[PDB]
Amino acid sequence: TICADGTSVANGACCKLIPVVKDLTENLFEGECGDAAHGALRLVFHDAIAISPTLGGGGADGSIAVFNATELTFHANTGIDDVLDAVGPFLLKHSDVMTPGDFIQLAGAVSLTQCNGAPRVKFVMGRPPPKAAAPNLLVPEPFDSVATILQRFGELGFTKEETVAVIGGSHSVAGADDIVPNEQGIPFDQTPSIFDTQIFVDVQLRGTMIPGNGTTEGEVETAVPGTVRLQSDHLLARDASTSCIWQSFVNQQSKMAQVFGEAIFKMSLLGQTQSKLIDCSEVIPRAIPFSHGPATLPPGQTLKDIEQACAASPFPTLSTQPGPVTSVPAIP
Ligand code: HEM
Ligand SMILES: [Ca+2]
Ligand SMILES: [Ca+2]
């Protein structure tokens, strides 16, 4: 079917989503891989992962928006109130054509296309409205152990490879608003507007510093001024179950993107039955091709500053970016 805009879709029910995509790209994200895009991506996880085989929760069901009055009382959802302040008006204005679970997955898929190197993910619609708030304690916290993290993701059907890709990859285009005391927009990697593998390098370095005037539980030292490091990422890069996976993504942007895209799509289906959904992948914007060079070590860092954790292979011999140590700019 040809939509009013000229887009051909396999299922004509998808045509009603085209204005939603345009609104998100023009008016929420403003064509940028910035604060709004980051929020929409994070919302995908906080909505979808909140499901357990034994404790309940509906997964990718829109509960985090509909039942925000409950789910925003959960510690793991710190900062989601601010995300919903930005995204929530768009969810409401487009609630005539799609359910909230569908909207959240759409917005995350569209967010990625705003970012250099991020994959164009598949997208399906047809998730029913949510029945209830997720239980508490289903969203992983940055102070959770690797074993805890792998149990949560693994029990939901993710491989370890997918788990590392989807966490690390997301943190390549991300910052913290609630970790560095009284500071917002503090990136996890040197390039929060680029979907590159700098996050993988940055986290493998020995940490030497904390930003700001104190820590929050689940934060550890970072190696690069103007960034922050989560304990969870720190441990995932160093634990024997995940460290070879973590290292495998360094300077492998295409591989990382492909795995990430597969993982996001899997995440999008949590709590759903793929049978009763409709493919609407044609509505997702074109991806922005990765246009940056190889991964590098940050200025002033050398291979002796890498904490080797993968026993199978040495850390790739990357170049060091030229020039003086500089503080990474905060995300506007
Ligand atoms: C063990 C798993 C994970 C943990 C513990 C974790 C933890 C965090 C924390 C603590 C923050 C900063 C939040 C704030 O300061 O308010 C954050 C930001 C973010 N996370 Fe993760 N995360 C995980 C997995 C993921 C996944 C799977 C995705 C995407 C599907 C994701 C996407 C993001 C994004 C995009 C941001 C930045 C938000 C912004 O700049 O507004 N995270 N994460
Ligand atoms: Ca949910
Ligand atoms: Ca990056």
Numbering used by the authors: 1 to 332
What do the authors report?
Manganese peroxidases (MnPs) are, together with lignin peroxidases and versatile peroxidases, key elements of the enzymatic machineries secreted by white-rot fungi to degrade lignin, thus providing access to cellulose and hemicellulose in plant cell walls. The primary mechanism involves the MnP oxidation of Mn2+ to Mn3+ and the subsequent formation of chelates with fungal dicarboxylic acids. The molecular structures of Ape-MnP1 and Cst-MnP1, which share 50% amino acid sequence identity, are characteristic of ligninolytic peroxidases.
It was surprising to find that the MnP-DDQ subfamily differs from previously characterized MnPs in two of the three residues involved in Mn2+ coordination, with Asp35 and Gln333 in Ape-MnP1 occupying the position of two glutamate residues in short and long/extra-long MnPs. Comparison of the crystal structures of Mn-free Ape-MnP1 and Mn-bound Ape-MnP1 shows that the Asp35 side chain occupies different positions. In addition, Gln333 located at the C-terminal end does not even appear in the Mn-free Ape-MnP1 structure due to the predicted mobility of this region in the absence of the cation. The different orientation of the Asp35 side chain in the structures of substrate-bound and substrate-free Ape-MnP1, and the absence of Gln333 in the crystal structure of the Mn-free enzyme, confirm the mobility of these residues, a behavior that has also been demonstrated for the two glutamates of the Mn2+ oxidation site in previously characterized MnPs. The movements of these two residues witness the dynamic nature of the Mn2+ oxidation site in Ape-MnP1, a dynamic that is different from that reported for MnP of P. chrysosporium and VP of Pleurotus eryngii, since the C-terminal tails of the latter are not involved in Mn2+ coordination. The kinetic constants of Ape-MnP1-Q333P confirmed that Gln333 participates in Mn2+ binding (a 172-fold decrease in Mn2+ affinity was observed for the mutated variant) but not in its oxidation (kcat was hardly impaired). Accordingly, based on these results and the structural studies described above, we propose that the position of the Asp35 and Gln333 side chains in Mn-free Ape-MnP1 corresponds to an “open-gate” conformation of the active site, necessary for cation uptake. The subsequent reorientation of the side chains of these two residues pointing toward the Mn2+ ion in Mn-bound Ape-MnP1 corresponds to the “closed-gate” conformation, in which the enzyme oxidizes the cation in direct contact with the internal heme propionate after being activated by H2O2. The substrate-free Ape-MnP1 model differs from the substrate-bound enzyme in the number of solvent molecules (207 in the Mn2+-free enzyme).
